[PDB]
Design a protein around this ligand. Structure first.
Ligand SMILES: Cn1ncc(Cl)c1C(=O)N1CCCCC1
Ligand SMILES: [Cl-]
Ligand SMILES: [Cl-]
Length: 182
């Protein structure tokens, strides 16, 4: 109903269409990417500095760390939106790694439409300190994008890329894409 064909447009990058969105996966350091939004997978206190969250907070800088702690004390947040600091993005969206991954991705997509953004880059949310299983995480990320497209909600969002630290996790995402392909 929505899925195109899986191919490789560049070395180490794999892609397929999901409605009007191009969905891509690759392995690398997410802090070197450029996108309108970069997603951080963190703790419910928004101050985890371990694995991909360490890299994101160190690169983003102390003003972003300060933004995170200020918002965390103000209210009970499922996720937080901050500036990009010294990352190459307009905003960072900090999601809780232990939360339902489909719900977290749905929220990121809706916030990006609100800002008329076109590109998103995310890690394999929940596979680090939260220790969620990689194929459940891949299934949830892709399901969220399918639902967003099915509801007619994709207008400004055109590109969603997962940059994955461990090559063995990339292999799981590629197999999930092949399961779905048209
Ligand atoms: C499990 N994991 N997924 C992404 C990242 Cl980053 C990590 C991580 O904790 N590290 C630190 C130890 C050396 C390998 C990378
Ligand atoms: Cl995590
Ligand atoms: Cl990752």
């Amino acid at each position: 109903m929505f899925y195109g064909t899986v191919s490789s447009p560049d070395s180490g990058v794999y892609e397929m269409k999901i409605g009007s969105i191009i969905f891509q996966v690759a392995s690398g350091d997410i802090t070197k990417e450029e996108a309108d939004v970069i997603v951080n997978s963190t703790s419910n206190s928004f101050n985890l500095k371990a694995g991909v969250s360490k890299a994101i907070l160190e690169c983003a800088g102390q003003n972003v760390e300060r933004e995170c702690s200020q918002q965390a004390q103000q209210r009970k947040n499922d996720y937080i939106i901050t500036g990009g600091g010294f990352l190459r993005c307009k905003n960072i969206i900090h999601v809780i790694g232990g939360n339902d991954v489909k719900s977290s991705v749905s929220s990121v997509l809706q916030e990006c439409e609100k800002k008329n953004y076109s590109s998103i880059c995310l890690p394999a949310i929940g596979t680090g300190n939260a220790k969620q299983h990689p194929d459940k995480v891949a299934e949830a990320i892709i399901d969220a994008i399918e639902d967003f497209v099915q509801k007619g909600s994709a207008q400004s969002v055109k590109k969603v890329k997962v940059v994955i630290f461990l090559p063995q996790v990339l292999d799981v995402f590629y197999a999930n894409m092949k399961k779905r392909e048209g």
